[PDB]
Ligand SMILES: CC(C)(Oc1ccc(CCNC(=O)c2ccc(Cl)cc2)cc1)C(=O)O
């Protein structure tokens with residue numbers, strides 16, 4: 001039962017995310033992606049080696065590739081969530097509310113899967129963008145990406161696997177305290193089932209792990225703070241970078257944060 005619940009969640013995760021952490025870990029270790037570390041390699045990646053609104057400048061261009069990637073992850077997360085029968089039993093507007101406030105927490109948790117201390121995979125693992133290059137970007141674009149790295153490196157210490165991640169992200173999305181939910185008790189009851197499924201699953205999958213479940217609850221709290229700070233950087237970019245186009249779906253997500 002609690003196993004059939006988790007296994008259903010794990011299959012919805014494999015069914016919907018192109019890049020698993022297993023796939024990613026193969027590539028980052030070497031079982032190779034074109035490395036983008038400066039303007040020249042970026043241009044080469046675009047010419048066809050690895051790959052939008054009208055061009056503006058390099059730092060805005062990278063930001064657009066960020067937007068394109070996160071919009072795609074939002075689409076996958078939505079399909080993943082609709083593939084959870086309990087999620088799909090909420091009223092559609094509550095489903096949207098959960099996604100609105102949950103996807104970025106889930107995106108920054110999943111980002112850890114494709115990152116190491118030196119950069120991150122792009123374009124389905126065919127490119128690799130260095131943390132160095134990202135840091136070099138014009139402000140404020142260089143400050144938005146670096147904190148995700150700090151979180152991702154500590155997060156990867158936990159050494160979760162894809163079966164853990166599927167339950168963790170389900171728990172991030174099925175969150176009872178999002179503003180404007182209609183049926184708080186029903187969502188709270190679903191979240192509780194996922195959390196018990198998670199503790200159960202971690203018991204068997206990480207038998208020697210001390211304090212992993214509470215450590216993961218703290219990561220959920222950490223992700224909430226990451227996304228609050230991220231949304232503050234986005235609102236500032238909206239005010240001061242008026243030439244930078246902002247994808248409409250992402251504008252709706254950030255409207256009231
Ligand atoms: C997209 C946007 C506006 O801001 C964000 C900025 C950065 C990241 C981290 C993920 N970045 C990437 O996946 C990424 C994609 C392509 C390139 Cl060339 C570099 C980095 C996530 C989100 C968002 O908040 O949705």
Ligand SMILES: CCCCCCCCO[C@@H]1O[C@H](CO)[C@@H](O)[C@H](O)[C@H]1O
Pocket residue numbers: 088089090091092093
């Ligand atoms: C502003 C609110 C208008 C949107 C109304 C859509 C509500 C219907 O939403 C439906 O509810 C069902 C459970 O009742 C779910 O199983 C379905 O997935 C969902 O589509």
